[PDB]
Design an enzyme around this catalytic site. Structure first.
Site, PDB file in Angstrom:
ATOM      1  N   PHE A 291       0.804  -1.196   0.000  1.00 51.89           N
ATOM      2  CA  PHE A 291       0.000   0.000   0.000  1.00 51.89           C
ATOM      3  C   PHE A 291       0.851   1.267   0.000  1.00 51.89           C
ATOM      4  O   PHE A 291       0.534   2.251   0.684  1.00 51.89           O
ATOM      5  CB  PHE A 291      -0.995  -0.038   1.159  1.00 51.89           C
ATOM      6  CG  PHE A 291      -2.323   0.634   0.856  1.00 51.89           C
ATOM      7  CD1 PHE A 291      -3.049   0.283  -0.281  1.00 51.89           C
ATOM      8  CD2 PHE A 291      -2.891   1.535   1.752  1.00 51.89           C
ATOM      9  CE1 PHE A 291      -4.291   0.844  -0.546  1.00 51.89           C
ATOM     10  CE2 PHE A 291      -4.138   2.097   1.507  1.00 51.89           C
ATOM     11  CZ  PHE A 291      -4.854   1.740   0.349  1.00 51.89           C
TER      12      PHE A 291
ATOM     13  N   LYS B 184       8.434  -7.538  -9.840  1.00 52.60           N
ATOM     14  CA  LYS B 184       9.239  -8.274 -10.781  1.00 52.60           C
ATOM     15  C   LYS B 184       9.993  -9.435 -10.182  1.00 52.60           C
ATOM     16  O   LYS B 184      10.131 -10.464 -10.826  1.00 52.60           O
ATOM     17  CB  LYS B 184      10.256  -7.348 -11.436  1.00 52.60           C
ATOM     18  CG  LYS B 184       9.630  -6.285 -12.312  1.00 52.60           C
ATOM     19  CD  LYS B 184      10.658  -5.429 -13.049  1.00 52.60           C
ATOM     20  CE  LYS B 184      11.496  -4.573 -12.142  1.00 52.60           C
ATOM     21  NZ  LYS B 184      10.687  -3.645 -11.326  1.00 52.60           N
TER      22      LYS B 184
ATOM     23  N   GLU C  78       0.883  -7.786 -15.937  1.00 51.75           N
ATOM     24  CA  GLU C  78       1.014  -6.679 -16.867  1.00 51.75           C
ATOM     25  C   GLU C  78       1.789  -5.515 -16.297  1.00 51.75           C
ATOM     26  O   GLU C  78       2.554  -4.858 -17.014  1.00 51.75           O
ATOM     27  CB  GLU C  78      -0.363  -6.145 -17.305  1.00 51.75           C
ATOM     28  CG  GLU C  78      -0.289  -5.171 -18.485  1.00 51.75           C
ATOM     29  CD  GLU C  78       0.288  -5.833 -19.753  1.00 51.75           C
ATOM     30  OE1 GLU C  78      -0.435  -6.614 -20.410  1.00 51.75           O
ATOM     31  OE2 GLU C  78       1.445  -5.528 -20.112  1.00 51.75           O
TER      32      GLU C  78
ATOM     33  N   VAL D  95       6.157  -5.023 -16.339  1.00 50.40           N
ATOM     34  CA  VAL D  95       6.937  -4.481 -17.458  1.00 50.40           C
ATOM     35  C   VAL D  95       6.105  -3.608 -18.408  1.00 50.40           C
ATOM     36  O   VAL D  95       5.020  -3.995 -18.856  1.00 50.40           O
ATOM     37  CB  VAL D  95       7.695  -5.604 -18.216  1.00 50.40           C
ATOM     38  CG1 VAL D  95       6.884  -6.867 -18.276  1.00 50.40           C
ATOM     39  CG2 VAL D  95       8.138  -5.120 -19.579  1.00 50.40           C
TER      40      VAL D  95
ATOM     41  N   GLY E 119      12.225  13.765  -9.754  1.00 50.50           N
ATOM     42  CA  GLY E 119      11.703  12.601  -9.051  1.00 50.50           C
ATOM     43  C   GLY E 119      11.846  11.319  -9.831  1.00 50.50           C
ATOM     44  O   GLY E 119      11.392  10.258  -9.374  1.00 50.50           O
TER      45      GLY E 119
ATOM     46  N   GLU F 242      16.123   8.065  -7.812  1.00 51.45           N
ATOM     47  CA  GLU F 242      16.364   8.132  -6.378  1.00 51.45           C
ATOM     48  C   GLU F 242      17.805   8.587  -6.119  1.00 51.45           C
ATOM     49  O   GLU F 242      18.610   8.700  -7.061  1.00 51.45           O
ATOM     50  CB  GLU F 242      16.120   6.760  -5.719  1.00 51.45           C
ATOM     51  CG  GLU F 242      14.666   6.252  -5.805  1.00 51.45           C
ATOM     52  CD  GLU F 242      14.524   4.772  -5.461  1.00 51.45           C
TER      53      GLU F 242
ATOM     54  N   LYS G  32      13.036  -6.793 -16.286  1.00 48.96           N
ATOM     55  CA  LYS G  32      11.923  -6.743 -17.227  1.00 48.96           C
ATOM     56  C   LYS G  32      12.183  -7.569 -18.469  1.00 48.96           C
ATOM     57  O   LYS G  32      11.286  -8.257 -18.940  1.00 48.96           O
ATOM     58  CB  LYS G  32      11.658  -5.281 -17.607  1.00 48.96           C
ATOM     59  CG  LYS G  32      11.009  -4.491 -16.434  1.00 48.96           C
ATOM     60  CD  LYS G  32      10.937  -2.967 -16.696  1.00 48.96           C
ATOM     61  CE  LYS G  32      10.318  -2.219 -15.525  1.00 48.96           C
ATOM     62  NZ  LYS G  32      10.444  -0.718 -15.668  1.00 48.96           N
TER      63      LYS G  32
END
Lengths: 320, 320
Positions: free
Chosen positions: B9, B111, B135, B138, B193, B196, B211
């Site tokens: 969350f 992933k 879905e 990737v 943004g 990081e 991916k």
């Protein structure tokens, strides 16, 4: 045992048979056993036990099939579960309605019935307990219908702008490169087989507009052909490409359905924009509310390409 | 009544709740009635009867949920039909395995589990009678998985070449335009943004390679992370863009799975090629045997974008 009837056995229908034969092992291990129980062309048919390669050999060898029974009789009487309706237009609406009214699934490549009777046919399919698939009607092998309707299902598709006619795209790309008059580039297009002796369906934007109507309706915009403002490419000259080039633009025939518009016409497109694609290609930009902008491009026509779209629909109906 | 548990969350999971709330009428008239019966973050949870907007308000207001029970307890005990697994990695594999072993569908955006245990998890889902949808792992909102796996199902996908990391695409596009050192363009990427404080996962090509492994496997190429040759973008300089520009090329981080290759690395791309796309974007070119070449492009990440992908999977499991 999935029973398939093929109606229409020109280029597309023969393409479907070739693919069903060539990819039989992979198709069967994906959707289970299948047999084509009937095939019909514009004046003959073959039904009962026969092989697809038999039907195919016979059509190529003789220009027709085995029996005198017409497509309509195969549609209303043959034993099948799904109808592949690839009929050679230049009847289709009646083949679809009659297979749906028999409670049969229908996969089609014909635009006409969908343009004339979109909601009437979707509802008929819904009232009976079956599906009307039409991936091959727009974009050829390029996913467009399953994309608009399944992938982007819970999005609000706000607009679609695309290139839905390979022949016009080729003529414009070729004119851009060679800088020769329309009359001459059209003759090349004809020599290559992209355009017929009467290239009107392509060059006057009719094909693209038919497809635009199908798409508009697929995304929830009720639309008829008379609602589309259609303009072809026959008045685009090398000089137009020159003045556009000087400011960073090429020219393309763009089909658009948005809040503001429903049209097919030539348009200036920046050279590095995704819709500046060249050659016999298709493309579509979907603008949505939650998935951003989604772009797709591929081959918009061809025998194996159209056949592929038909197969993707058969897979969608029966994969499990 | 479709019962949904959301595990994870942070940004994605909250995105899913926002969308489920915002699109409730359209979702329900597409797949029927649904209720989220449990939500869990990295240290707390909310279950029983509660509202999604309650859960959402509480998370934003306090940084956590209502109960002390951890995600694992919600996964192994809560009453749900489908698990949305959007866990904040920096456990996931165990949440998937345990929902699948309970005979629950799973839609994930993580992933890691797929990279480590692809066939093990697909088989577990198959052995129980459920689906593992991914879905969102990737391409973000861009269809890639449903495209490779459903649309292009009866095609032999021979290769996929794409751009699977928006941050590197942005850094390279920005470096192309501004012609400033990597250190500086990275600081812009950080201010915006996109990257990081430790941008490694992006700039060293790790994200794109993870991916690429998922995609390779989806198209039938068994692959592990150690099989990918990974090269990042930190040694691409403005001078590299200048020498490439002089010959018609830009530079992009391209992920490729083909017969010859399995790699992620910088590569020269002609300016007008479809993979020359700029900004924080994703893209993929599928080369197939029967549908020709199929190209897709869109947003590769974002809260609403990832949430959309998750929803497209929920639709796929339950549309009828």
């Amino acid at each position: 045992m999935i029973k398939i009837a093929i109606v229409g056995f020109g280029t597309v229908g023969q393409g479907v048979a070739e693919l069903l034969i060539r990819k039989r092992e992979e198709i069967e291990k994906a959707i289970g056993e299948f047999k084509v129980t009937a095939v019909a062309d514009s004046k003959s048919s073959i039904s009962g036990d026969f092989s697809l390669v038999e039907a195919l050999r016979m059509k190529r060898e003789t220009g027709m099939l085995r029996d005198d029974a017409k497509a309509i009789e195969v549609v209303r009487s043959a034993d099948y579960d799904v109808l592949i309706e690839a009929s050679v237009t230049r009847e289709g609406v009646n083949y679809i309605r009659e297979a749906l009214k028999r409670g049969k699934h229908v996969v089609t490549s014909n635009k006409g019935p969908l343009v004339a009777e979109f909601h009437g046919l979707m509802s008929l399919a819904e009232r009976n307990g079956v599906r009307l698939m039409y991936e091959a009607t727009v974009g050829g092998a390029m996913p467009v219908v399953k994309l608009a309707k399944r992938y982007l299902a819970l999005c609000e598709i706000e607009s679609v702008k695309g290139i839905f006619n390979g022949t016009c795209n080729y003529i414009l790309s070729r004119m851009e490169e060679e800088r020769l008059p329309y009359e001459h580039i059209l003759k090349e297009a004809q020599e290559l087989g992209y355009a017929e002796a009467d290239p009107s369906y392509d060059v006057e934007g009719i094909d693209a507009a038919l497809k635009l109507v199908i798409i508009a309706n697929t995304i929830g915009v009720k639309a008829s052909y008379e609602d589309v403002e259609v303009t072809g490419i026959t008045q685009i000259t090398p000089e137009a490409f020159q003045v556009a080039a000087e400011k960073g633009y090429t020219i393309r025939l763009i089909a658009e359905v948005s809040r503001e518009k429903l049209k097919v016409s030539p348009r200036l497109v920046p050279f590095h924009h995704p819709l500046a694609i060249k050659g016999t290609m298709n493309a579509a930009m979907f603008k949505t509310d939650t998935a951003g902008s989604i772009f797709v491009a591929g081959r918009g026509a061809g025998k194996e390409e159209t056949a592929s779209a038909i197969l993707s629909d058969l897979y969608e109906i029966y994969a499990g």
